[PDB]
Amino acid sequence: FLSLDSPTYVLYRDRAEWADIDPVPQNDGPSPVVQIIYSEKFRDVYDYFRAVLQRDERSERAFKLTRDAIELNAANYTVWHFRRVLLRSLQKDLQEEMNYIIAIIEEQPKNYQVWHHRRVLVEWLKDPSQELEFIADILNQDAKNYHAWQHRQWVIQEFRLWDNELQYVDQLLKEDVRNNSVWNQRHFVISNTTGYSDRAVLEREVQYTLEMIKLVPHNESAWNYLKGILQDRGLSRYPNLLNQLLDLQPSHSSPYLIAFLVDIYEDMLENQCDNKEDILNKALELCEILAKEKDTIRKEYWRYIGRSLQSKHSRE
Amino acid sequence: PLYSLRPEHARERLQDDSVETVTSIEQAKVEEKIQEVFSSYKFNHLVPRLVLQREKHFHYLKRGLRQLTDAYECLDASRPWLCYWILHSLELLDEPIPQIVATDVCQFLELCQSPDGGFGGGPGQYPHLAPTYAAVNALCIIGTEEAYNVINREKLLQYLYSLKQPDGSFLMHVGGEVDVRSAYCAASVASLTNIITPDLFEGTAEWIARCQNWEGGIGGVPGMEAHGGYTFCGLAALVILKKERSLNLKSLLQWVTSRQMRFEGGFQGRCNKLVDGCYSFWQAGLLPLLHRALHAQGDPALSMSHWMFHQQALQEYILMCCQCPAGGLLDKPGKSRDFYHTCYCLSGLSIAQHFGSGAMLHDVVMGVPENVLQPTHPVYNIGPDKVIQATTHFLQKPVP
Numbered sequence: 001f002l003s004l005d006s007p008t009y010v011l012y013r014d015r016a017e018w019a020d021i022d023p024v025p026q027n028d029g030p031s032p033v034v035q036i037i038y039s040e041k042f043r044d045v046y047d048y049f050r051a052v053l054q055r056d057e058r059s060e061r062a063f064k065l066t067r068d069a070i071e072l073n074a075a076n077y078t079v080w081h082f083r084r085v086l087l088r089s090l091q092k093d094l095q096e097e098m099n100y101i102i103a104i105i106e107e108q109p110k111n112y113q114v115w116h117h118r119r120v121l122v123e124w125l126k127d128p129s130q131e132l133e134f135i136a137d138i139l140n141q142d143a144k145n146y147h148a149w150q151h152r153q154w155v156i157q158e159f160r161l162w163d164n165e166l167q168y169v170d171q172l173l174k175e176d177v178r179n180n181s182v183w184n185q186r187h188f189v190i191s192n193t194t195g196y197s198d199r200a201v202l203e204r205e206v207q208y209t210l211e212m213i214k215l216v217p218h219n220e221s222a223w224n225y226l227k228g229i230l231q232d233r234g235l236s237r238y239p240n241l242l243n244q245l246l247d248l249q250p251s252h253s254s255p256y257l258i259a260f261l262v263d264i265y266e267d268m269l270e271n272q273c274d275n276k277e278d279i280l281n282k283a284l285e286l287c288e289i290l291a292k293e294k295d296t297i298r299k300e301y302w303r304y305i306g307r308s309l310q311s312k313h314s315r316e
Numbered sequence: 317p318l319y320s321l322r323p324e325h326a327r328e329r330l331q332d333d334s335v336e337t338v339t340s341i342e343q344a345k346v347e348e349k350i351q352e353v354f355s356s357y358k359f360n361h362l363v364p365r366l367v368l369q370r371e372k373h374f375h376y377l378k379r380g381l382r383q384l385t386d387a388y389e390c391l392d393a394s395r396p397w398l399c400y401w402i403l404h405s406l407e408l409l410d411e412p413i414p415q416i417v418a419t420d421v422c423q424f425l426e427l428c429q430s431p432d433g434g435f436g437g438g439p440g441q442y443p444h445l446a447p448t449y450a451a452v453n454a455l456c457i458i459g460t461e462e463a464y465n466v467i468n469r470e471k472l473l474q475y476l477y478s479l480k481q482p483d484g485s486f487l488m489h490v491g492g493e494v495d496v497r498s499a500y501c502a503a504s505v506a507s508l509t510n511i512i513t514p515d516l517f518e519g520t521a522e523w524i525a526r527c528q529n530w531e532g533g534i535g536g537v538p539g540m541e542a543h544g545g546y547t548f549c550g551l552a553a554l555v556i557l558k559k560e561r562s563l564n565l566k567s568l569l570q571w572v573t574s575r576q577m578r579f580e581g582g583f584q585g586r587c588n589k590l591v592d593g594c595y596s597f598w599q600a601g602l603l604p605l606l607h608r609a610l611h612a613q614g615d616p617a618l619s620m621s622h623w624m625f626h627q628q629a630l631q632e633y634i635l636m637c638c639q640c641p642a643g644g645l646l647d648k649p650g651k652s653r654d655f656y657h658t659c660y661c662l663s664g665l666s667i668a669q670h671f672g673s674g675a676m677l678h679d680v681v682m683g684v685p686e687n688v689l690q691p692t693h694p695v696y697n698i699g700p701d702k703v704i705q706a707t708t709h710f711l712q713k714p715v716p
């Protein structure tokens with residue numbers, strides 16, 4: 001086969017195996033809008049794809065053409081559809097097709113069609129043996145590629161491949177404690193394996209998280225994580241978490257510690273705590289410290305917080 | 317007086333903890349370029365002039381509505397998006413659309429419609445829900461008896477029904493996958509065209525609601541990291557179905573507001589990622605929605621003049637760092653212009669300069685007073701008038 005990028009690649013209208021079929025021009029209307037001035041190459045491939053699509057030609061040449069129409073526009077879902085019908089009725093080998101999709105993902109990891117197709121392949125073949133490691137290759141180039149993580153969440157749930165992901169997460173979390181996609185991955189694994197209700201997994205988790213904060217005080221990912229696994233059961237359910245954060249403040253702190261403090265306070269007053277007035281005032285002062293200085297981009301947020309905090313707890 | 321130019325603003329710079337990673341390295345480079353952008357005035361001894369290049373943008377847009385360079389081949393399967401992005405940008409800039417182009421756009425969306433319902437990404441391409449949302453949006457913007465009429469409602473509902481899943485989700489297209497994005501698309505066309513039957517969206521609010529994670533935002537699919545584009549789709553869809561309360565609104569408000577870059581002033585799409593002009597709509601657009609939702613719960617502490625985000629700081633980002641001098645808007649300085657970023661940067665700017673929550677109206681518009689744009693609806697991302705007009709029109713038709 002000729003690569004769409006070979007030095008010797010030839011237009012389709014100049015091929016022998018294609019001399020019998022007339023290309024089919026695009027019908028944009030008597031006089032169009034948002035009309036694209038396709039290149040000769042582009043127009044060539046899609047003019048001939050229109051032809052095989054129109055005649056529903058489940059031919060081998062057709063299948064080969066789809067490939068060229070995919071490189072030209074890997075987002076053309078119509079072509080991806082046709083390719084799949086061609087792949088099935090031609091009894092085309094799916095491991096070769098995996099080799100194909102492996103290559104084009106590597107080539108454009110940010111395209112959606114490219115990832116769905118891989119999913120279709122893995123389901124068809126009922127085999128996820130090479131998934132986790134391929135995905136780990138993509139994540140090696142873009143540790144945050146949404147589709148890659150999507151794909152690895154799918155693989156792991158669908159074929160029960162939970163056993164090694166926390167190791168994986170720890171691998172990556174080590175490379176960049178800031179990769180929010182990896183924190184999310186952490187939550188995912190734990191949630192679907194041991195869950196956060198296990199006193200021992202919680203303690204560990206928070207502990208680990210406090211350790212991460214201590215080393216990277218301004219990394220918002222660890223803070224959201226620590227707030228995420230405890231705000232559900234009620235921040236106030238954990239009474240010495242406040243004293244501890246106050247002890248980290250000295251030489252660490254920032255707008256993340258202070259907001260968390262006001263977050264602990266909201267739930268405290270929300271749960272008939274004691275010293276309600278001192279805590280309320282304590283929280284409103286931070287609300288302004290945040291609005292007026294530490295985190296003014298969010299001034300409006302914090303103004304609202306301190307406002308509703310009052311409406312909710314004023315002595316009245 | 318520019319907030320982003322104030323000397324204090326420097327204290328809002330990446331507070332790396334003397335521990336470098338890909339994330340901080342990257343963030344510090346955008347931070348450094350944006351800084352050069354803000355300092356350009358002082359360095360050149362000029363007084364900042366926040367001016368939105370209307371004329372330039374209109375040029376780009378007027379032209380592209382008609383012909384694009386082979387540089388848009390990668391959008392050959394997204395033509396209807398080309399229409400919406402452009403027509404929407406135009407209406408945002410107040411530029412009218414002459415009846416002949418309107419009829420033209422109208423006729424092409426026709427060629428894009430499938431006989432079984434929904435719209436394809438181009439003439440003869442299969443129906444997908446994104447082009448379906450874009451096309452219907454595009455038509456409601458024209459909003460002529462001609463536009464409205466293009467949409468084949470009995471088939472639109474047939475198509476939507478063939479995408480619906482039992483768990484409440486929707487396929488993006490026959491044989492494709494689900495994601496919150498599709499729920500929104502379907503809610504949107506189903507709403508504007510008065511096609512919502514009593515069971516169509518059954519389970520959809522519950523499914524959208526399980527894409528909200530620990531971060532507070534919404535993932536593309538249950539278990540996925542919080543994402544601005546998806547969050548917008550999730551909350552928007554829930555506002556249509558009137559089920560916002562299905563979400564943890566409190567954790568969602570905290571998450572949006574935290575997506576504003578304390579320095580750049582614009583919004584990132586994910587925690588610990590980089591600013592991006594388009595997230596000016598996706599994220600800031602969530603503020604009026606959250607507002608409407610909390611308002612409906614009789615929340616008394618709400619502001620009556622401003623969104624819960626730094627409208628000012630965001631406007632400065634779009635105006636200073638997101639305009640391509642040749643016309644068209646962008647992600648960030650150093651990125652190429654494109655109609656997508658033109659559409660959303662504008663969409664966002666309009667959002668940032670317009671507050672309204674009942675009878676309470678309140679603009680805030682950085683730079684020259686000509687920077688004011690036409691208001692945009694936060695659920696549909698088309699002009700409020702375009703929404704009222706379309707729903708009144710379609711309501712006069714019987715639900716298939």
Ligand SMILES: CC(C)=CCC/C(C)=C/CC/C(C)=C\COP(=O)(O)OP(=O)(O)O
Pocket residue numbers: 075446497501544545546549654656
């Ligand atoms: C349907 C809908 C309203 C979605 C909004 C939510 C969402 C997923 C937003 C992000 C879009 C994105 C990552 C790329 C689109 O830009 P592009 O047009 O430059 O083209 P590209 O996707 O190929 O990158």
Ligand SMILES: [Zn+2]
Pocket residue numbers: 592593594595647657
């Ligand atoms: Zn963007």
